[model samples]
Target: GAMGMPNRKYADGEVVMGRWPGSVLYYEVQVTSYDDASHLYTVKYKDGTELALKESDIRLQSSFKQ
Candidate 1:
């Protein structure tokens, strides 16, 4: 039922690395929703925290994975 931009880097339910506001603490968050107007990603951490992130702040797991 989700429809919007076709160029989104990540999709719903995909697990990826999300950078915190400080950029010093990176956590693995799951993508839940997205905004077509703001181009922001809605990610939820394991510790009961949800936040919007920019493309620059979101990092793929593959890039930092071992």
Candidate 2:
């Protein structure tokens, strides 16, 4: 578990965004909202657009994947 939540755990590359010219993009799922049977998360965009996400979907990241 990345943030210490057992069911909300994510793979390294599975959840990654990209790096911008002067900034980065990443998504942090609230561990408190994660349910074991169905892990649901909201992707908060920098532009203020919040989208729903699944545990299996790859989350965005700030820096490039190394």
Runs in model 2 lying further than 4 Å from the true structure: 1-7, 10-37, 60-66
TM-score of 1: 0.76
Q: What lDDT would candidate 1 get against the real structure?
A: 0.79
Q: How many residue pairs clash in each candidate?
A: 0, 6
lDDT of each: 0.79, 0.41
Local error of candidate 2 at 12, Å? 15
Enumerate residue pairs that collide in model 1: none
1-66: candidate 1 lDDT, tens digit per residue: 323234687778888888897766789999888886888999999887898897667777668445
Model 1 misplaced regions, further than 4 Å: 1-6, 64-66
Pick out the ten consecutive residues of candidate 2 with the lowest summed lDDT: 12-21
Q: How many clashes show up in model 1?
A: 0
